Amino acid sequence: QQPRPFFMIFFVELWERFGYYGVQGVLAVFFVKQLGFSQEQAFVTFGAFAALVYGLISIGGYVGDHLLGTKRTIVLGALVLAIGYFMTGMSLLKPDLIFIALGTIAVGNGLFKANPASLLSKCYPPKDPRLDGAFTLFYMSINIGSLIALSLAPVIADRFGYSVTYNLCGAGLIIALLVYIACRGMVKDIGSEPDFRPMSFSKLLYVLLGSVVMIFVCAWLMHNVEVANLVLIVLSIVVTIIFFRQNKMFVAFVLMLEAVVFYILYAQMPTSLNFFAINNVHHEILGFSINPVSFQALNPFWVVLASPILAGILSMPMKFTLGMFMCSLGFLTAAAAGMWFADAQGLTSPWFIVLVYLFQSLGELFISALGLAMIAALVMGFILGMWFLTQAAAFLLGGYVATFTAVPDNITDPLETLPVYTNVFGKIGLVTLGVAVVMLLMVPWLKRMIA
């Protein structure tokens, strides 16, 4: 159905995302259990890590387009990522390595992420009808890899330990690299302009130097989240000032703030919703016992099933509005499950968390899948930078919000933790509902501005 390089890119993306989500699914539990962080420390540290992973995505598109070429930067990103996963596995012998190892993953992700999609765009003549379907299959590739990793990595970490889990993340990257190298002949005439000139060693060294610098800066920021907060605060107010100085951009700004709220909520899946499943949900569904950390896999699960359907099935601001209503309902469902449908021992049915994740995933499919594509329809490089800055800020804010559900390690009674989750999730849902209503009200004016 698709060009031959499509299948190469599909499987490279699948394996890279498997490595990444293998780490993400276990990281907060690893912080708590292996490093002895309180839940509060673990949540803010995950927030900082996630902020760096997402804010640095801006670098790899520039490196691939203008310095080294898309294909070279795919290889380099994959190699830096694999090194990061093996360093994380090594951090169990050498605990002091952990932050450097996470910085290496963040920077590796930054170099890699934009480039396969860019590559995929170049596999099709410019107005090929199959493009939409190919990109929906690309998103499904991401979520198949994520589904496998979030399902299996907690089980593997429980049975064989974290070193094995992280080494298998690294191995997934190695095999992404092997399938790329094996399929290299399929993309010989596919690439950005630097891909076809001999590699500039000057620029390669600049990229390696900057990467190493960034790895150390990332390590420091994750170790000292209290200064990452002000770094992003002052960057945010400053770039806000310079955005205001310089009206389709105003629409881009309001959609950016709405996206920020969405990402604050999305950030709860590996933290507060993860520990809610651990502490206050039954660990049994359809008669099978499961690791509750695996409940995170319900997000890619619902995306994999729902992306074709919704591909089969207003315009921009209303799709954003719908996503915000879905997210609101996910958190109100969580609160309701805890407030009214718990057992006398304080435990709730996992079908409520299945429903929570359905809502949240529909929110993802309406918003983040369809955001910067027509933020690119309203617009440049400055707004991309501000975009990535705001989404990083959203993840830091999300770690902070998650700390309101943090449970001290000595608590053992689910009836003590359930009202904490329900209060926070109910308030998140109410605030998000209010935000969704104000977006609804702004939909017509916004839709005029888009003209």
Partner: nanobody, 122 residues
Framework: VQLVESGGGLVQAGGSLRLSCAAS????????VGWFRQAPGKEREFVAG???????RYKDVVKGRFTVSRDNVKDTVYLQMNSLKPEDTAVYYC?????????????????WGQGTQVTVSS
């Protein structure tokens, strides 16, 4: 996922016994381990437990007499039972639930030992 209990037996009132729980494939370190007991003609009831990060929970009638503790090198959980009384006679079970919570009812725990008889004679 399968726990092996050891250390039950017969003892006189005022004596002591220690039960131990070990898991096979999964490291017990990630699990809250609760001890339940079933006396003749009644339901399994929560006795005592330790979560994955040293938090403790106890039934009122065993406080000041039973101690739950954990040896994370040997991957084992212990119930040290002192000042035993006839009404402590029961089959004792260890149960394991992933994480930090020790729910009071058997349905909160997925993994179960086979049970060890404890008898306390007057």
């Amino acid at each position: 996922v399968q726990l092996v209990e050891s250390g039950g037996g017969l003892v006189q009132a005022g004596g002591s016994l220690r039960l131990s729980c070990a898991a096979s494939g999964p490291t017990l370190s990630n699990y809250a381990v609760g001890w339940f007991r079933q006396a003749p003609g009644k339901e399994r009831e929560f006795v005592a437990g330790i979560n994955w990060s040293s938090g403790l929970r106890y039934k009122d009638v065993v406080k000041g007499r039973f101690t739950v503790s954990r040896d994370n090198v040997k991957d084992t959980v212990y119930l040290q039972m002192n000042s035993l009384k006839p009404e402590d006679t029961a089959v004792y079970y260890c149960a394991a639930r992933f994480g930090g919570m020790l729910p009071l009812q058997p349905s909160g725990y997925a993994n179960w030992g086979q049970g060890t008889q404890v008898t306390v004679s007057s």
